[PDB]
Ligand binder design. Structure first.
Ligand SMILES: [K+]
Ligand SMILES: [K+]
Ligand SMILES: [K+]
Ligand SMILES: [K+]
Ligand SMILES: [K+]
Ligand SMILES: [K+]
Ligand SMILES: [K+]
Ligand SMILES: [K+]
Ligand SMILES: [K+]
Ligand SMILES: [K+]
Ligand SMILES: [K+]
Ligand SMILES: [Mg+2]
Ligand SMILES: [Mg+2]
Ligand SMILES: [Mg+2]
Ligand SMILES: [Mg+2]
Ligand SMILES: [Mg+2]
Ligand SMILES: [Mg+2]
Ligand SMILES: [Mg+2]
Ligand SMILES: [Mg+2]
Ligand SMILES: [Mg+2]
Ligand SMILES: [Mg+2]
Ligand SMILES: [Mg+2]
Ligand SMILES: [Mg+2]
Ligand SMILES: [Mg+2]
Ligand SMILES: [Mg+2]
Ligand SMILES: [Mg+2]
Ligand SMILES: [Mg+2]
Ligand SMILES: [Mg+2]
Ligand SMILES: [Mg+2]
Ligand SMILES: [Mg+2]
Ligand SMILES: [Mg+2]
Ligand SMILES: [Mg+2]
Ligand SMILES: [Mg+2]
Ligand SMILES: [Mg+2]
Ligand SMILES: [Mg+2]
Ligand SMILES: [Mg+2]
Ligand SMILES: [Mg+2]
Ligand SMILES: [Mg+2]
Ligand SMILES: [Mg+2]
Ligand SMILES: [Mg+2]
Lengths: 155, 224, 206
RNA sequence: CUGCAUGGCUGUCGUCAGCUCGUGUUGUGAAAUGUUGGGUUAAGUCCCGCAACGAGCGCAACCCUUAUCCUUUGUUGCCAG
RNA sequence: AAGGCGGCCCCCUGGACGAAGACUGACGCUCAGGUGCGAAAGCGUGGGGAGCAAACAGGAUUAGAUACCCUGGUAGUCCACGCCGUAAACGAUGUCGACUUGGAGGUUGUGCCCUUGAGGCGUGGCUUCCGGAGCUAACGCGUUAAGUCGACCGCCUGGGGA
RNA sequence: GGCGUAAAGCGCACGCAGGCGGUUUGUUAAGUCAGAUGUGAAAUCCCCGGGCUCAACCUGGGAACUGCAUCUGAUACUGG
């Protein structure tokens, strides 16, 4: 029912008296393809357990985005610690023009045509954070008309 | 419930104006003795509203979990909880009761098993060793979660006393999506609570009236 | 640190011996070595017959060997020529006559010898050690074992540097002498060297 | 020949009291919490308190021997009447 | 204004703040180049020299000890008038203006209330410590912002070489 | 795009040139905006077509050349 993507697997370490202890971290995203997205981060001593933890984490932790038949409503900007993200709707037939970490998020979101660009840090975790936060702050025209209390043509 | 029982129970008395929280400026009538005075005409309709939705939750067969662990108010809460066929938390709130239900349900399984062997098992195989420990550990289990032993699953509403002393349970309920009903004293913040009721919380008569009225209204919830 | 052999430390407490004969120091060494020869045989000709334990017992002047097995049909064979073709040669090796009995192990997934043999047989078939280990553990734990832990060691996956990798599950109190601990060892001879496998299975106390 | 390709076995820190995990929670993250705090113990031993709740390998017990008594049997061992 | 300023008295003199009014009527803010002020050490000329003390000498310590420690000790430290123009000259945070939840203090004015005390209720200036939103890579900052904004100026563009 | 700690706030101030300018009314029309006219060579780029068996290539018409000058209007904002 939901599409799942594995974005990053990293090996991290922690020193003890005996020596170094290695662990694996997995960052994944899951979506339904019609405007629901979640990201998940997992850690484990072994990789498949880490990936399963991240998928379990991301089946919860899922937000809604209001799409316009496969593309955004307007140009959006998202920001997290080091990552700045600019996304912009495109015409039919452009495809997802985005970086490696944005591409999975926008693919499993159900978006089909955007032009995106990453500035600053392209650390995958923060880039996924910023893309999610820039998608969630994007508003549909009917909610703008509800805000302003007037449902004029511009819908 | 109306205005004058709430005055003479001392619902209007706040904490000192040193320890106030800004977010509850709207529910503050004034100050005397450098003591906040809680606004009472604000308390009455939102209390009634909380009571109404508690009733409706009650008759759709909702499980309600009273929370109060103050030494001076928790016996009133056991009183009110089993007077109205509901559940209570009177001793220390285990961090993770709701978000980590999968793990604490083994604690309640342990509690149930060693109580069925307690005296309708009637083993009294003593070992030289195990009265002193098995009995004391049943005590340790039932004083902290003996009020939750019959819940089975996640509750349907949180009734809170003194939201600041009970921030862990409130944030747990906010993550899990359970409604929170809290008496909000002048020093606590109301943003985790979805049904705010400003009143006094340190006096035992305010608490008595609160849970008397709520126990009543859920008893006539289960009445339907 | 180095551990005590968990079967040896429990001999006479909860675990019995694999040989139950008496002898003076006159015939002790030859009894012992002819037992070694019979055991070496009943190891190496019943290789793929899943034998777990060989109990040798010597009444007055003759032997009886009890073979614990998971697959009794192959060591009892087609109407029973095969225990004949075994005792005719075990009486040959031990010089005295012989008798053979065959006991069945009904759950071959709760015996450390069979589980070790399984994991080494898979390791010699070029299978990823992780899958062997985890399947052994989950099969042993889904049949009522109170605990298990497996450990493989030595050039895993053809690496140049040998490693020791172990997987535990349940409860294995090796310091409790009451503990029913079934332990065994096996070795897989691959194209990169020997790989050692150890298996502990805990079934209960007393 | 290569223990610097390995299995098995052994020494060592050290019989030192420690070493971790699941779920939850906190942090963008490496990670943290639990395992810290007040007492106590030979001991992460135990009790209180506590965003933690539980579990595993260790500690302790279960094993052998020595120190007291009782019952049974009585030679090849014993000698009170 | 910054550098800085500490017995008491007198003379000359700059700024700040408050009360209630009166007056002028945008006369304002910032500022490249320019000008002025600018710790300590140092330099020039002339005085002064108690204490302290670079250099220097001796005694120790040490493998050595051009040091740390001890006994001495000159320039200098002090005054007048010139020069120098640099400091971790730091809040490592340019100036000016507006806006945005709180708490506890210090100091200096002023208004009102039985001034009944070393009482209570207000309203200005300057200042210290916590901390909310927000911001930040984090640490932290947080109405005296590193928050939200405007005007002008200075500066940065990998580490060495420098 | 930055300048508390990563490179980066002059040691501090005064101040000329320069940049910037509270509020109201009137006036002007310099900035600004609208329209028109002249010009912005052809070729090149782009659109719609046409010819070489297709393509490259060649070619018809348009669009564009974001600019400048002049004339006529607008007066909210900036300037006088
Ligand atoms: K070795
Ligand atoms: K954990
Ligand atoms: K003065
Ligand atoms: K200058
Ligand atoms: K001196
Ligand atoms: K030396
Ligand atoms: K001198
Ligand atoms: K300073
Ligand atoms: K941090
Ligand atoms: K400047
Ligand atoms: K260079
Ligand atoms: Mg530790
Ligand atoms: Mg800790
Ligand atoms: Mg323990
Ligand atoms: Mg604890
Ligand atoms: Mg000087
Ligand atoms: Mg001089
Ligand atoms: Mg001189
Ligand atoms: Mg000296
Ligand atoms: Mg000199
Ligand atoms: Mg001078
Ligand atoms: Mg300098
Ligand atoms: Mg200074
Ligand atoms: Mg500087
Ligand atoms: Mg500042
Ligand atoms: Mg100035
Ligand atoms: Mg602060
Ligand atoms: Mg360079
Ligand atoms: Mg930069
Ligand atoms: Mg530095
Ligand atoms: Mg710097
Ligand atoms: Mg400065
Ligand atoms: Mg300078
Ligand atoms: Mg100027
Ligand atoms: Mg000027
Ligand atoms: Mg103006
Ligand atoms: Mg001007
Ligand atoms: Mg004009
Ligand atoms: Mg054609
Ligand atoms: Mg004008």
């Amino acid at each position: 029912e939901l599409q799942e993507k594995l974005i990053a697997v990293n090996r991290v370490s922690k020193t003890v008296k005996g020596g170094r202890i290695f662990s694996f971290t997995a960052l994944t995203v899951v979506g339904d393809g019609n405007g629901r997205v979640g990201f998940g981060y997992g850690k484990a001593r072994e990789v498949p357990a880490a990936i399963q933890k991240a998928m379990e984490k991301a089946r919860r932790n899922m937000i809604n985005v209001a799409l316009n038949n496969g593309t955004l409503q307007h140009p959006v900007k998202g920001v997290h610690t080091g990552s700045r993200v600019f996304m912009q709707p495109a015409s039919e037939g452009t495809g997802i023009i985005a970086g490696g970490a944005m591409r999975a998020v926008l693919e499993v979101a159900g978006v089909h045509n955007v032009l995106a660009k990453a500035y600053g840090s392209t650390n995958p975790i923060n880039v996924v954070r910023a893309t999610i936060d820039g998608l969630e702050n994007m508003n549909s025209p009917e909610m703008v008309a509800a805000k302003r209390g007037k449902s004029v043509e511009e819908i | 419930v109306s205005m004058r029982d709430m005055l003479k129970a001392g619902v209007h008395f706040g904490h000192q104006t040193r320890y106030w929280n800004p977010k509850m400026k709207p529910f503050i009538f004034g100050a005397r003795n450098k003591v906040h005075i809680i606004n009472l005409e604000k308390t009455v309709p939102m209390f009634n509203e909380a009571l109404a939705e508690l009733n409706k939750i009650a008759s759709r067969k909702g499980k309600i979990l009273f929370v109060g662990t103050k030494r001076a108010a928790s016996e009133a809460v056991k009183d009110a909880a089993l007077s109205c066929d509901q559940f209570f938390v009177n001793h220390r709130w285990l961090g993770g009761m709701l978000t980590n239900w999968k793990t604490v349900r083994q604690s309640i399984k342990r509690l149930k098993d060693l109580e069925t062997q307690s005296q309708d098992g009637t083993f009294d195989k003593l070992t030289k060793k195990e009265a002193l420990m098995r009995t004391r550990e049943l005590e340790k289990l039932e004083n902290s979660l003996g009020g939750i032993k019959d819940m089975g699953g996640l509750p349907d509403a949180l009734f809170v006393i003194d939201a600041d002393h009970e921030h862990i349970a409130i944030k747990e309920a906010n993550n899990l999506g359970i409604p929170v009903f809290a008496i909000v004293d002048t020093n606590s913040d109301p943003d985790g609570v979805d049904f705010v009721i400003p009143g006094n919380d340190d006096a035992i008569r305010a608490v008595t009236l609160y849970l008397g009225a709520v126990a009543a209204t859920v008893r006539e919830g289960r009445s339907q | 640190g180095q551990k005590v052999h968990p079967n040896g430390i429990r001999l006479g407490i909860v675990k019995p011996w694999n040989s139950t004969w008496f002898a003076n120091t006159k015939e002790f060494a030859d009894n012992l070595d002819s037992d070694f020869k019979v055991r070496q045989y009943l190891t190496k000709e019943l290789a793929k017959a899943s034998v777990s334990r060989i109990v040798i017992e010597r009444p007055a002047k003759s032997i009886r060997v009890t073979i614990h097995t998971a697959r009794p049909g192959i060591v009892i064979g087609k109407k029973g020529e095969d225990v004949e073709k075994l005792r005719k040669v075990v009486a040959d090796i031990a010089g005295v006559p012989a008798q053979i009995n065959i006991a069945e192990v009904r759950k071959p997934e709760l015996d450390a010898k069979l589980v070790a043999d399984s994991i080494t047989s898979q390791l010699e078939r070029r299978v990823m050690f992780r899958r062997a280990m985890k399947r052994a553990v989950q099969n042993a734990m889904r049949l009522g074992a109170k605990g298990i832990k497996v450990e493989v060691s030595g050039r895993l996956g053809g690496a140049e540097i040998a490693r020791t990798e172990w997987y535990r599950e349940g409860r294995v109190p090796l310091h409790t002498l009451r503990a029913d601990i079934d332990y065994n060892t096996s070795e897989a001879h691959t194209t990169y060297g020997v790989i050692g496998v150890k298996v502990w299975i805990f079934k209960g106390e007393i």
